[PDB]
Ligand binder design. Structure first.
Ligand SMILES: CCCCCCCN1CCC[C@H]1C(=O)N[C@@H](Cc1ccccc1)C(=O)O
Ligand SMILES: C=Cc1ccccc1
Length: 454
């Protein structure tokens, strides 16, 4: 039985001021570097334990002993995402009900049905880059956000955000980003009801109304469509829980739409941004991925079957999720008194945070070269220890969108590598912006067309 270390404290504020930074996940990774596989982190009236080793996280992933917890970040996001799938407790009726109703929207048959609309948006991205002038550059995270928002809008809801028709972010995005930054900034506040934050609260409520106004319009656009969609919104409005026999009610549907619009794009745009970053910093890897794209994508319009054959592009995306998992933590609570790693006794209700980027740097798993971008690490899933690689979370509360995100990202990165040579013209220094999620900031490249027709 060991006592766990704890980072520096600030009297009655305990560890809370360590979150007073624009890059709190990166700050917690540096604390994990110093303190090791487990540390205690306290705020007034609250306690959690940050896990960084596969040795402890494999036990935390035992669903008989630990369930999904709402982190403070998720409690703040619940102000607008309610009892949607991401911010519901496992024991809330609406979690298993929505899970049962929406899981078929991510079947192989559903993915084949989404493919053509993913191609619609991917082609808009390729055309945008084909149409840039000499020595114009690409704003990578900006364009990846245009693509991933438009893809979830069109595939999920038959709604066109038309993000490639805008030089400024879609108003949905401006409000969503400001809501997430507010949720992140609020983590450090000991006295959140201090009138000093009255303006923050006004702006937050304004951003929530902007997101609900867009949901209103999507629900209206479908009500009056009088056309046969069989998409995510079809299942939300018409699907029945095989268990309870009931459909989702209007309040829960609104929360699911907000949830899928945010979760269905923010993390995928980060993944694509980090993937292109690693490819231009690792030219040998880029060449191998581009050779696969050229050999497989033999038609002007990629097919579902062809994207499934981009195996190396799939490994590039897993290796980008290893180094910078874009949803960089998840939280667990102990269902009963238990002992972690034979050393750390926990009581029922005790909370854990899984620090995913630090898990993915465990030298006992990946070897000494852990900072190197090597997609070949993923050649054989059987050679990776259990729970070493957790970018989609765990168990029945794992990402419902995993195959959607990876199909989209594989299709898009395949078309990017088929159609362009990329240049890191600024020798970009990686700068990771935090909005709860992680994304490169200020990442720019030049794309020289290979002049291959669409
Ligand atoms: C939206 C998908 C990503 C969510 C990631 C959330 C993960 N946080 C994103 C920012 C930092 C990181 C995190 O460690 N947060 C803890 C912070 C906290 C711990 C103890 C007491 C008070 C507050 C939390 O929110 O509880
Ligand atoms: C439900 C909120 C959310 C926010 C960011 C990423 C994924 C999900």
């Amino acid at each position: 039985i060991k006592e766990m270390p704890q980072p520096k404290t600030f009297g009655e504020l305990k560890n809370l001021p360590l979150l007073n930074t624009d890059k709190p996940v990166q700050a917690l990774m540096k604390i994990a570097d110093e303190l090791g596989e487990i540390f205690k982190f306290e705020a007034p009236g609250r306690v959690t334990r940050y896990l960084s080793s596969q040795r402890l996280i494999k036990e935390a992933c035992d669903e008989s002993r630990f369930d999904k917890n709402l982190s403070q970040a998720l409690k703040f996001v619940r102000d607008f995402a309610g009892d949607g799938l991401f911010t519901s407790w496992t024991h809330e009726k609406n979690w298993k009900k929505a899970h049962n109703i929406l899981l078929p929207s991510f079947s192989q048959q559903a993915m084949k049905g989404y493919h053509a609309m993913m191609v619609d948006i991917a082609v808009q991205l390729v055309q945008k880059w084909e149409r840039l002038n000499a020595d114009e550059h690409i704003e990578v995270p900006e364009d990846m956000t245009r693509l991933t928002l438009d893809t979830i809008g069109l595939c999920g809801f038959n709604y066109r955000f038309n993000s490639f028709y805008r030089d400024q972010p879609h108003p949905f995005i401006t409000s969503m980003v400001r809501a997430l930054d507010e949720a992140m900034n609020k983590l450090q506040r000991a006295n959140p009801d201090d009138p000093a934050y009255d303006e923050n609260k006004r702006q937050f409520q304004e951003d929530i109304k902007v997101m609900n106004d867009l949901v209103d319009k999507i629900i209206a656009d479908r009500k009056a469509s009088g056309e046969q969609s069989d998409d995510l919104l079809t299942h939300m409005l018409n699907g029945k829980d095989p268990e309870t026999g009931e459909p989702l009610d209007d309040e829960n549907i609104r929360y699911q739409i907000i949830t899928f619009l945010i979760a269905g794009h923010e993390t995928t745009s980060g993944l694509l941004s980090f993937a292109l970053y690693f490819l231009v910093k690792n030219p040998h890897v880029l060449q191998k991925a581009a050779e696969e794209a050229a050999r497989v994508l033999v038609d002007p319009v990629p097919s579902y079957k062809q994207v499934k054959q981009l195996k190396y592009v799939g490994m590039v995306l897993n290796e980008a999720l290893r180094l910078w998992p874009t949803a960089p933590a998840f939280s667990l609570y102990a269902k009963e008194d238990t002992v972690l790693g034979g050393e750390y006794p926990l009581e029922k209700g005790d909370e854990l945070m899984v620090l995913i980027p630090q898990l993915h740097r465990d030298k006992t798993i990946w070897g000494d070269d852990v900072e190197e971008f090597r997609p070949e690490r993923f050649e054989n899933p059987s050679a990776i220890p259990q729970h070493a690689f957790k970018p989609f979370g765990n168990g029945q509360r794992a990402c419902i969108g995993q195959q959607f995100a990876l199909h989209e990202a594989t299709l898009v990165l395949g078309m990017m590598l088929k159609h362009f040579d990329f240049e890191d013209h600024t020798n970009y220094e990686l700068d990771i912006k935090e909005t709860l999620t992680l994304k490169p900031e200020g990442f720019v490249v030049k794309a020289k067309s290979k002049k291959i027709p669409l």
